[PDB]
RNA sequence: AUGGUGAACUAUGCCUGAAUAGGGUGAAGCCAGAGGAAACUCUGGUGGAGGCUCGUAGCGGUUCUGACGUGCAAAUCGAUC
RNA sequence: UUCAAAUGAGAACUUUGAAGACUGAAGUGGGGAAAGGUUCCACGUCAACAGCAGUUGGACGUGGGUUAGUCGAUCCUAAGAGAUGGGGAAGCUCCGUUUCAAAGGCCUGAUUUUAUGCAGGCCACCAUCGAAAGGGAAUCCGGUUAAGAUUCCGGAACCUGGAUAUGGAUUCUUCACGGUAACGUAACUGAAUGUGGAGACGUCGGCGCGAGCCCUGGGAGGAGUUAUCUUUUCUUCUUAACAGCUUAUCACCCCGGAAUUGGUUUAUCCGGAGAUGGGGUCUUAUGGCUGGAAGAGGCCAGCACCUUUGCUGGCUCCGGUGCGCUUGUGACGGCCCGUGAAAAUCCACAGGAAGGAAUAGUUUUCAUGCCAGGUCGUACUGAUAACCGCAGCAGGUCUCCAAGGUGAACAGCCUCUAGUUGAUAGAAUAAUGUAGAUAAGGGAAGUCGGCAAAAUAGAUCCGUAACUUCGGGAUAAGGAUUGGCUCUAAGGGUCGAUCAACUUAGAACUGGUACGGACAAGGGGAAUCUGACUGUCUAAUUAAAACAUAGCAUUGCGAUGGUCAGAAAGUGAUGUUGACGCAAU
């Protein structure tokens, strides 16, 4: 339990403590699935709330699939700029 | 010496055909009153794969003329035949792909398949995928029909023999390289025990007429006469010529 | 991006079997794995099952065809020959 | 194995001509948001099934006991 | 960390030797042998599953009422509604077409 | 030479079952973006193919020509593979 | 391995207690298939056997022990085996399995002399054997013995076969009503014959969901530690078959009519052959609540006492988390010149032969009630001692369950549960060995030969040639970094607030410059001979350049046939086959 608390604070995680590859520790597909589900969940929420019409929703749906946005914050800012123009 | 490999196959112990997954024998309808006078209509219910056979098979259901029930037949499917299609078989059937007609009821140049050698044997000729028989003429006297066979030979067949209009489906199969020993393994796994094959010159004299010697060589002409006996017929049997 | 220059689908075989043999398999692998128009429902939903069997995802129609293509060149010629001969029997 | 919720149906089971035994169980349990109350279960032993009637009202429970047929063998706790 | 054992003499992991781990009122983990799952009845024409029909092992159908094994319609429990609709329309139109061919 | 007995080992086919961590590589198909008059050409992702690859259980048995060599053993033991 | 006690004539070896250790969940743990056959358990006992010992034992002597309508066998069929009818053979016998055969019996009507003679029709499938892992009607929990249990006891269920009554339902419109529909229900006639479904099925990949396990918060008990510290460490808090209600991705129905194309998966598929959207229907894998059921089981406290040994009290509650582990399952996707059993058995539908109501009948597919369920197997070992190897032999022998930490990991290393502590011992430390190791300077000078050994090794970042079938070569080659500690930034869910995961990057500080600190873990390069590759063989001296392989070519054959088998045959293999085939090189 004491060791787990140290790990939660960021300790024992340097290059000298890693034996598997980055993929073995955390698969890149798992990271992608988390991010795309985050982006798609936000787009449906905005469209249902009426903040975005279906025409702009469809454009942003295929941009997120095309790796246009690196995180949720980048998508929200892009929506604001699109609505500001 | 001992009994050679090609002699052991006739005993039929481990060299029998692997027929567990076969859909059934592919035959035409039994030649009956409806076929030889008029026609009878069937329906293609499904087109299915057959293990050990390149060409697909079609299941066609006909009504029993003399009993209230349905009779199912297994046909070798031709190109263009689809599920739900009506198939017409008999002397008075139309000239369409999939129909079964006597050879004397079609004009010259008609392409047919699953042709009967004799009327009623339910199909013997042009059964493999992509093969067909070409009708080249008729002889109304003596009721004979002249056709061309896939091997190129010319045969005289009775005009009452039946055949299916079209060409056997699945053609072009042998144009694709097998590319590996594994695919050859799975091919003959559904057919029979004949693969792989060990060369005779790699054996000992007790095993094969080509065996032995301080080098691998046949040592005598590989052209064997038609009159040789079992244990001698290894190589090129009754060869008229050799070379490229 | 473009991942391979010329091997295409035959990149799964690596460097084995020879280039000429891999080239021949490439032509027939693309044909057998493609989607074809259904002559019954008009959609592009026909794919091969076993060799010589072609089924449409819609409308549940199965058509007997070639080993790696829906229709071979020989089968097309046979249809024209039968159609020409049929027209000379009724009229 | 089977639970009944209608009291009128319960009395019909007690005189079904195949029922010979019954038991009464008292449970001291708590209600949704108050102090514990008294729960009683009336169990009728049929030929193939056991019927259980549960009533959470003590006042209504005592009346049911007095209404049971005398010929029925009743087991307490 | 309790470990379980088979409750029959079959020691192999076959389709008829499936088990599920359950916890008993005695507070221990014990293997529970489960039967193979049932398959829904299929339509006679299109082959899709039939709506409103119970999913049971073949022998268990004899132990349930007729309500669980049919639908209140022609060919109920044998053909689906859309396939029955096709049969009725096809039967009517063809029979009408036969009359106009007769005259 | 005559008449008999063996496929519980093993060889091969068939029928019906069961078994096989974690990694590397990243083929088709698909999405977005960039360049160009056009044909089309590049970039980033996605995807997870192979009688591919590192390496456990498993299967096999290269070397030390190691141990043993009236042995634990009429073929085994250890390391390496 | 050690100390002590007990027993005994006698104790390194038996029993008990204490201590030190190991197996470390792919076990030295807990069950089985085959094989063995009483080795199982108790009492008595030590001549022989346990290559020392023996008071002990799988030894010796005498007894005890295996309980089933629900678990298997029994039934079904698989590859295959094999009677009959017939044909061969001097003959023992051979062929063949639906075959050149007059190959057989259940629905009844007819009869109240008696039991079935006798009228139609139906059906022609035409022995039998073949699976303790395939198919398959039906059971669970708690308790109980020296040794038995899903088999005994208590409680609670279910199936099949057979008897029958009541209630309910239905009928004077004789064989039910509702919903536009998908369809719903406590029921709600149906012979021959026909059709359909279930039985019934490959493999790999990721994703969703369920169960058990793992981790964890609060609280109610018990135990450990306490010089000091620790609201702390460990442990208990459980819910079966079955039953009622309810619960679903997929699929389907109704309304409506779409380009400013929309919807939508991690994975690109769907829509005028009707999308999105709104409202509905259904499968019940699965979960929830309740009955079963707290009366059980579990954890504690207070009382009796040689004793048959109990008696009385409490508590057994409420949450969180996930690329976790194992396993089940759903919707999908990849692959084949490979497309991945059969039968018994059960149900539904189409059909309409018959039987039926008014002072009366039918439904045992609705509910309740009554009776029966035979035969054989069942103990135990399952292996460094119960099997096979001449044996209590380091060999061989099919399979299920699988905790914590480290770490990519079922690797190695340590620990909990459980199980063992068994292998003749004591003393000494010569040579020579077997096994494990280290060496100054030189660095293959050794040797047939770098044989053996050493060096390299994880991860992150940088960098990477000739050649090439353009796929590779490649971890090419060649470099740098890695601890601890204190911080910072970014990446989410539900509804401004609130809650919850280890992933990556960076910066100071710190040390005998150490940090994949044990464990774990590639030497590399330039060329020649040879086989293309993966694969295969001389069980027990040869693993290769040998065999095989894809590719290429040649030969025979159109069935009254090619190749091959047989003593013969009304006999066979290829052949459930037909030249894109079979056969021979
Ligand atoms: Cl041979
Ligand atoms: Cl198998
Ligand atoms: Cl070895
Ligand atoms: Cl020495
Ligand atoms: Cl070569
Ligand atoms: Mg990814
Ligand atoms: Mg990826
Ligand atoms: Mg040789
Ligand atoms: Mg010779
Ligand atoms: Mg010769
Ligand atoms: Mg079984
Ligand atoms: Mg054998
Ligand atoms: Mg062979
Ligand atoms: Mg390898
Ligand atoms: Mg040696
Ligand atoms: Mg010696
Ligand atoms: Mg160890
Ligand atoms: Mg240990
Ligand atoms: Mg004993
Ligand atoms: Mg002795
Ligand atoms: Mg002695
Ligand atoms: Mg016989
Ligand atoms: Mg049998
Ligand atoms: Mg026992
Ligand atoms: Mg037992
Ligand atoms: Mg023996
Ligand atoms: Mg022996
Ligand atoms: Mg030195
Ligand atoms: Mg030195
Ligand atoms: Mg030298
Ligand atoms: Mg020298
Ligand atoms: Mg070496
Ligand atoms: Mg080689
Ligand atoms: Mg490999
Ligand atoms: Mg050898
Ligand atoms: Mg060797
Ligand atoms: Mg060779
Ligand atoms: Mg045969
Ligand atoms: Zn279509
Ligand atoms: Zn349907």
In E 27-46, which Cβ lie closer than 7 Å to strand G? 27-30, 32-44
Domain shared by E54 and E88, yes or no: yes
Cα diameter, chain E: 85
Three-state SS at E87: helix
Which residues, 6 or more positions from B185, have their beta carbon under 8 angstroms from its beta carbon? B195
Q: Give the separation between CA D23 and CA B51, rounded to whole angstroms.
A: 68
Specify whether E78 is located in the same domain as E101: yes
Same domain, E52 and E85: yes
Shortest CA–C1' contact from C38: which nucleotide? G273
Whether residue E97 sits in one domain with residue E58: yes
E27 and E2, same domain (yes or no): yes
Ligand nearest to the CA of E14: 11
Q: How many Å from the CA of E1 to C1' of G19?
A: 29
For A45, the enclosing helix (H) or strand (E) is helix A28-49
CB contact under 8 A, B173 and C67: yes
* DSSP letter for each residue of A12-33: S-SGGG--S-HHHHS-HHHHHH
> Cα angle at B171 between B166 and B172, to 5 degrees?
150
Spatial contact of B131 and B148, defined as CB atoms under 8 Å apart: no
Query: How close B132 gets to chain C, by Cα (Å)?
Result: 10
- Selecting from B111, B171, B179 the residue whose C-beta is nearest the C-beta of C67 gives B171
- Amino acid whose CA is nearest the C1' of G328: E20
Tokens (6 digits) for E4: 């379980």
Three-state secondary structure readout of D32-72: CCCCEEEEEEEEEECCCCEEEEEECCHHHHHHHHHCCCCCC
User: Burial level of B158, CB count in 10 A (0-12/13-18/19+)?
Assistant: middle
Residue among B130, B128, B155, B164 nearest B35 (CA): B164
* Separation of alpha carbons D13 and C39, rounded Å: 69
3-state secondary structure of E90: helix
A21: preceding bond cis by omega (within 30 degrees): no
In total, how many domains does chain E have? Answer: 2
Residue–nucleotide distance: B15 CA to F1 C1' (Å): 35
Q: DSSP state, C12?
A: G
**Residue whose tokens read 């409750």:** E7
C27 in contact with B at a CB cutoff of 8 Å? Answer: no
**Does the distance separating the beta carbons of C69 and B176 come in below 8 Å?**
no
C82·B81 Cβ contact <8 A: no
Domain containing residue E54 = 38-103
Instruction: Tell me, in angstroms, the distance from the centre of ligand 4 to residue B9's CA.
Output: 67
Exposure string over B183-206, b if 16+ CB within 10 A, otherwise e: eeeeeeebeeeeeeeeebbebeee
Pick left, alpha or beta for residue B177 (phi over 0 → left; psi -120 to 50 → alpha; otherwise beta).
Answer: beta
What's the half-sphere exposure (Cβ side, CA atoms, 13 Å) at C69?
14
Do E33 and E51 fall within a single domain?
Answer: no
Specify the 3-state DSSP secondary structure of B148.
strand
Based on the domain organization, do E59 and E78 belong to the same domain?
yes
Which residues fall inside 5 Å of ion ligand 10, going by CB?
B 209
Do E81 and E95 share a domain, yes or no? yes
Q: Is E47 found in the same domain as E95?
A: yes
**Which residue from B113, B62, B172, D39 is spatially nearest to C82, judged by alpha carbons?**
B113
Place of tokens 């194995």: D1
In terms of domains, do E100 and E66 share one?
Answer: yes
E31 and E77 in a common domain: no
Q: How far is CA B165 from the centre of its chain?
A: 16
Structure tokens at B173: 């199969």
* CB-CB neighbors (< 8 A) of B46 in chain C: 62
Interface test with C, best of B177, B180, B190 (most C CBs within 10 A): B177
Test the B interface: residue of C66, C67, C80, C89 with most B CBs within 10 Å: C67
Asked if E17 and E63 sit in the same domain, the reply is no
Hey, are the CB atoms on B171 and C74 less than 8 Å from each other? yes
C-alpha neighbours within 13 Å on the C-beta side of residue B122: 12
């Amino acid at each position: 339990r004491a060791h787990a608390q140290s790990k939660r604070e960021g300790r024992h995680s340097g290059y000298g403590k890693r034996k598997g590859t980055r993929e073995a520790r955390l698969p890149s597909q798992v990271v992608w699935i988390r991010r795309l589900r985050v982006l798609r969940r936000l787009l449906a929420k905005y469209r249902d709330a009426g903040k975005i019409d279906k025409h702009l929703y469809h454009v942003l749906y295929k941009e997120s699939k095309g790796n246009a946005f690196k995180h949720k914050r980048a998508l929200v800012e892009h929506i604001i700029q699109a609505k500001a123009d | 010496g001992r009994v050679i490999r090609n002699q052991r196959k006739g005993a039929g112990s481990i060299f029998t055909s692997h027929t567990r997954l076969r859909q059934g024998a592919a035959k035409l309808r039994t030649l009956d009153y409806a076929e030889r006078h008029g026609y009878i209509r069937g329906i293609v219910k499904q087109i299915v794969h057959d293990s050990g056979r390149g060409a697909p098979l079609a299941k066609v259901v006909f009504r029993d003329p003399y009993k209230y029930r349905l009779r199912e037949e297994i046909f070798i499917a031709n190109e263009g035949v689809h599920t739900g299609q009506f198939i017409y078989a008999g002397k008075k059937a139309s000239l369409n792909v999939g129909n079964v007609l006597p050879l004397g009821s079609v004009p010259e140049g008609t392409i047919v398949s699953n042709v009967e050698e004799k009327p009623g044997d339910r199909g013997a000729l042009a059964r493999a995928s992509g093969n067909y028989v070409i009708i080249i003429g008729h002889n109304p006297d003596e009721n004979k029909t002249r056709v061309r066979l896939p091997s190129g030979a010319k045969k005289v067949i009775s005009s009452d023999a039946r055949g299916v209009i079209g060409v056997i489906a699945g053609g072009g199969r042998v144009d694709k390289p097998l590319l590996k020993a594994g695919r050859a393994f799975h091919k003959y796994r559904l057919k029979r025990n004949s693969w792989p094959k060990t060369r005779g010159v790699a054996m000992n004299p007790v095993d094969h007429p080509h065996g032995g010697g301080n080098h691998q060589h046949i040592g005598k002409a590989s052209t064997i006469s038609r009159g040789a006996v079992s244990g001698q017929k290894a190589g090129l049997i009754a060869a008229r010529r050799t070379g490229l | 991006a473009k991942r391979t220059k010329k091997v295409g689908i035959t990149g799964k075989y690596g460097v084995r079997y020879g280039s000429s043999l891999r080239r021949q398999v490439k032509k027939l692998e693309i044909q057998q794995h493609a989607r074809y128009d259904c002559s019954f429902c008009g959609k592009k939903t026909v794919k091969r099952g076993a060799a010589g069997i072609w089924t449409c995802s819609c409308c549940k129609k199965t058509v007997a065809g070639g080993a790696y293509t829906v229709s071979t060149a020989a089968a097309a010629t046979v249809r024209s020959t039968i159609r020409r001969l049929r027209e000379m029997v009724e009229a | 194995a089977r639970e009944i919720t209608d009291i009128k149906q319960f009395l019909e089971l007690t005189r079904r001509a195949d029922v010979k035994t019954a038991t009464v169980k008292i449970n001291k349990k708590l209600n949704k948001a108050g102090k514990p109350f008294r729960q009683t279960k009336f169990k009728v032993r049929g030929s193939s099934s056991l019927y259980t009637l549960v009533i959470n009202d003590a006042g209504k429970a005592k009346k049911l006991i007095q209404s049971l047929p005398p010929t029925l063998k009743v087991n307490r706790l | 960390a309790q470990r379980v054992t088979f409750r029959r003499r079959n020691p192999y992991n076959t389709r008829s030797n499936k088990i599920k781990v359950v916890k008993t009122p005695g507070g221990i983990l014990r293997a529970q042998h489960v039967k193979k799952l049932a398959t829904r009845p299929k339509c006679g024409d299109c082959g899709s599953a039939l709506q409103g029909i119970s999913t049971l092992r073949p022998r268990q159908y004899a132990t349930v009422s007729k309500t669980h094994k049919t639908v209140s319609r022609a060919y109920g429990g044998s053909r689906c509604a859309n396939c029955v609709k096709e049969r009725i329309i096809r039967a009517f139109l063809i029979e009408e077409q036969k009359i106009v061919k007769k005259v």
